[PDB]
Amino acid sequence: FLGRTGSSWFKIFLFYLIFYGCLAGIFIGTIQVLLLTLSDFEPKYQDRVAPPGLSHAPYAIKTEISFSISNPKSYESFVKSMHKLMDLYNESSQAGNSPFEDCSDTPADYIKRGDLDDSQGQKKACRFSRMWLKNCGYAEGKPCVVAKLNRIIGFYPKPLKNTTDLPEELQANYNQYVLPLRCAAREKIGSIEYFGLGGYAGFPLQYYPYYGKRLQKKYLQPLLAIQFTNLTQNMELRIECKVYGENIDYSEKDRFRGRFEVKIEVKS
Amino acid sequence: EGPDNDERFTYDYYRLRVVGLIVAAVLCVIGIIILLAGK
Amino acid sequence: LDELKKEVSMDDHKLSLDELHNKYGTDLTRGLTNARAKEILARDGPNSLTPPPTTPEWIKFCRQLFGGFSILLWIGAILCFLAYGIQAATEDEPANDNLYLGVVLSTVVIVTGCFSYYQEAKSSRIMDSFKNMVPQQALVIRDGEKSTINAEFVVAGDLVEVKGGDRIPADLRIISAHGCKVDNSSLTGESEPQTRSPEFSSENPLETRNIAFFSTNCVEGTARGVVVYTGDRTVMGRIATLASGLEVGRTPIAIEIEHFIHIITGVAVFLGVSFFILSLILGYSWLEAVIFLIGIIVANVPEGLLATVTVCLTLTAKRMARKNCLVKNLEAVETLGSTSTICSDKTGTLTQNRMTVAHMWFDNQIHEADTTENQSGAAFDKTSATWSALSRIAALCNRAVFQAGQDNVPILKRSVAGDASESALLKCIELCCGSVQGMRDRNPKIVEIPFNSTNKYQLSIHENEKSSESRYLLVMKGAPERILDRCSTILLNGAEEPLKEDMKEAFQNAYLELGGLGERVLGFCHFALPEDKYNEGYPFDADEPNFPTTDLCFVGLMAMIDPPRAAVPDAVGKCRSAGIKVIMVTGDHPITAKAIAKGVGIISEGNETIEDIAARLNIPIGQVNPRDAKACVVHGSDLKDLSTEVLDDILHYHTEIVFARTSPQQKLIIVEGCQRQGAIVAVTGDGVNDSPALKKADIGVAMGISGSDVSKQAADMILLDDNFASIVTGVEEGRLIFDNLKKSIAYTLTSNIPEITPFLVFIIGNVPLPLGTVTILCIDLGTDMVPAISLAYEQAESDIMKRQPRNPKTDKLVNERLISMAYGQIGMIQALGGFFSYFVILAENGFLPMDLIGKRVRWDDRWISDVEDSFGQQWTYEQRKIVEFTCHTSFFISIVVVQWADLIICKTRRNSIFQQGMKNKILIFGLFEETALAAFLSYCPGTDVALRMYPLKPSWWFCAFPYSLIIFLYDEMRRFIIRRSPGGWVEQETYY
Ligand SMILES: *[C@@H]1O[C@H](CO)[C@@H](O[C@@H]2O[C@H](CO)[C@@H](O)[C@H](O)[C@H]2NC(C)=O)[C@H](O)[C@H]1NC(C)=O
Ligand SMILES: CC(C)CCC[C@@H](C)[C@H]1CC[C@H]2[C@@H]3CC=C4C[C@@H](O)CC[C@]4(C)[C@H]3CC[C@]12C
Ligand SMILES: *[C@@H]1O[C@H](CO)[C@@H](O)[C@H](O)[C@H]1NC(C)=O
Ligand SMILES: [Mg+2]
Ligand SMILES: [Rb+]
Ligand SMILES: [Rb+]
């Protein structure tokens, strides 16, 4: 033929069949032992998610949400993702004492449901009403963005203490139980309005620590609705929403490390 | 610890780099020694 | 074009002096007119040689920039700029990826260009050396007056004059001469002075006395002649053009390189476009379809391989430089290993090029002297009183002297003023009797008759050094038979005795044997003149026989030859044991050529020519079956009337071939004949008459000390110490580097698979990219480099000089067996070890292997800063990317770890590491430096930006260890099978 005879062509097939078969069987074996060394409830390493990311619902083309108020299908793209998220926080999804629980309607302290063990059933998560998100189809004019803190197993978000000076200096400082979120731009051509649990501009600490998908399915993380009823129009406004805390840090590279990058433009 | 389990989300990448560079250097020296056993 | 120059020349030495003048419109006495000479100048053109048109270095460099790998890397470099252009227009990408990767790849092409350019070097100044043989000026007779002119202004027809010490300015017809002798070594390779006279003495113009040639010099006397040829039209000017004009051609090693380039280029374009369409079918945007292709290019092309080859060659050439063997062309480092036929000059190559005493006949006994340079033999006789009598004649009846200031150099190497035979005798006595000058001071010469053409002997009368005599001793030497007709007694073991027919017959026997050995034989005799008949003041007349020259006492015979170099016989046998055919090709006479052939082992004992059979059986040569003769001796005059097909039959039908009295073109023809049969041929030589053959040879080797400038220009290799044993070393080195290149190539190729497979699974699986493009270049250009080079220092696995020369048609540098092992077996195991570490990193950070399938869509989505892992955690864009790049880093390090084992297995093709050992210090160096580089690239701060290399946790380093070990075991088991059964299965499938 090309290389060899039929007899040789066969033998080279019988070899590579057994050979690659063995190699596949060995590869699988090493994957088995790897998995055997891992927990079902907690990942081996967590230093790469460490400082929590802050992500929002409006799917930004490039950290930007520009549209026209005087146009219907101009914002119907951002309403798709906005709906996708909030559709999960339905009351019909949170039914019965299992696996949900009514928690303080005001920001409270942490809740420990034991260890990362299966020695108990599904760890009961705090309910969250999308109805706590006042004012927010969504904002056809002047968007109503929804913030979110990235989930990390066993992470206890710790707010800053009012020992020294603060950006939003001491205003509504629920020091003990709220992780604040203050959006900014100089360039003050807007109108910041925050909505959340208990009416505070933060995340209620009663939703922590997260026990993971395996130990807490259907779990709901707290949301923080933000509305920009800015009196300006037809210009790119670089708005940055920042979260503050002891366990919260940022990076010049990762522009989502505990903060937002939104470029709103109501070009109408 | 409980609420004070910050060490869980931390890794000493600084020491690791110091050690890694020490090792790389020493392996580089060892190599020179064996090569220079005759030039 | 040069087929005309490969033919024997035609001449006009047969014409009379007068007749020759009519042909060139010339005067025998007055010479040309100033006007007629200038007319002929403009007509024929200058008496000069024009160098052939060369290829500029520009075109030479750029021709490498387009050879398979460079072509693919160019397509990659441009395709980078393509994707970059498409980006800069569509979505403003502030990145530098495609732009920088395009710059990097273009640099890789340029630098790789320098390496191949360095390897494909051609240092040739043939025509320049020939031009150095034309004198600046010549002496001509114009308008009846002699004047010096620019030699280029010399034309056919003018009257030229030459004298001892000057170069022949052009081909001349001798019309007048006085004691003129010439050095024709340019045409023959033999430096013994040849007389020139107006008389025609041979039909063959290269042998006649009435022609003098350009490229030669007058050694003594004076001559006048008419110019018959000028410039390019001279006999050796044509040789110049032939030699300088010959097409170089591709080396065996070069052909091998291009061959695997085709193979690897083939699989590259195959998988390249095979997956380019496979991606579009899967609905991949052309934006991405090209990005994947660039990666495929980088994965398939072994970026550092061609440069490795060059470095391995260079390092092998450095070792040979350290044995006095200079390599002018890096590729010639290997050709000697692939050589199946050596065509060797004799004089100054196989031989020392110095008349040396070989045997002596005295006391009715043949004695042998030591002919070797360094005198590696033993003594023959010292005791016999006869010896001292013969020794005295050899010293006394000798007019040769050592040049001043030689006392530092060895006797046999020092320059001597005199003819070759007298120098030989001088050096013979000086060696075994101490200072000859002393013997010539103790015995003052009073009268002598120098060797005469008519007398055929030379005699001398000396004052006997003996005090009790202080009388007159007569000594003489000459033609053995002439000396015999002047002897009455023979000095036997001390005492004289009558010359009976018995001893006279033993003389003839001794004389015939020595002459049969191709040796020049001289007779020696002396006579103690009677005291009473010769007073202490008796005057001797040298002009008229004033003393007896008959009834003298015969002392002995001495024989001499230009002997082989000490190492030559043994080197020839070694070449022949390695299955290399050795042919002699010489300008010298057949009797001498044949005798040295037997001396060095070109013709082995018992082997006969057709002429030998005929003489032994006493029958006509036509009655001899030529197939009964494995040896042959072909004279150039017969070679001339043979067609190439008939030359091919001679080459095919004889194992032991001697081509004697060959011209320079004839040497070229013999070389081409050998090549025509498909053989790789080496030429060894030292003369300008070797230049064409040296050029045409696959590898030409010139002698460094004895070699002429031309020969060393025409060669690929120079033996700086004239050590012929270096050929044996060269062939051995050549074979070793050929095997080690295979090892180094397999090693380099093996790591291609773990660089290809990640890109494929990226498409077919939709998982995060396991390894990056930049990461690949950190391997092929970084870590694999020193290890791959180090394989060039591997010792032989068996006695390589015991095997036959490789068949260049069947035995390739890269074959299917190499690809099967590197791509199909070992590289495949490396790929898995890479993937394993990849799955380990991701799973330990929360992304278990199961959830990875079909996630790249959301993974690469820059706007999704919340991807959910297996544990329900949410990752931003840059966070997951850090883990991904950490995956690139550990996959990279996995390659390094699996290359550890590969380096050790590529060490040997057959033998076990437990047999070959770990005595390669460069290899061990490679292991340490490779690991140091990898660690540095991972842990050095800032490398996460420039190369996207991230620090690895200690446990990460050990992921591929079980795969590294399986490689070592697998290959060790496999080779154990090879050795345990030379049959073929494992062998014919995987044996590189
Ligand atoms: C989650 O809540 C949303 C609230 O808008 C539900 O949307 C409803 O969709 C139905 C049918 O398309 C409409 O008739 C209603 O007007 C919507 N609102 C309400 C309050 O009922 C959505 O269907 C819910 N999703 C799930 C899975 O239950
Ligand atoms: C990523 C995976 C799916 C690709 C696997 C590719 C396999 C099928 C390839 C890789 C190397 C290949 C072999 C390389 C060498 C030889 C020897 C040659 O004389 C015949 C073909 C043969 C035997 C090839 C057959 C196919 C082969 C085994
Ligand atoms: C939000 O909606 C409420 C009614 O639910 C209305 O009273 C109020 O004006 C709205 N706020 C703004 C800022 O438009
Ligand atoms: Mg010679
Ligand atoms: Rb490669
Ligand atoms: Rb050559």
Ligand SMILES: [Rb+]
């Ligand atoms: Rb490679």
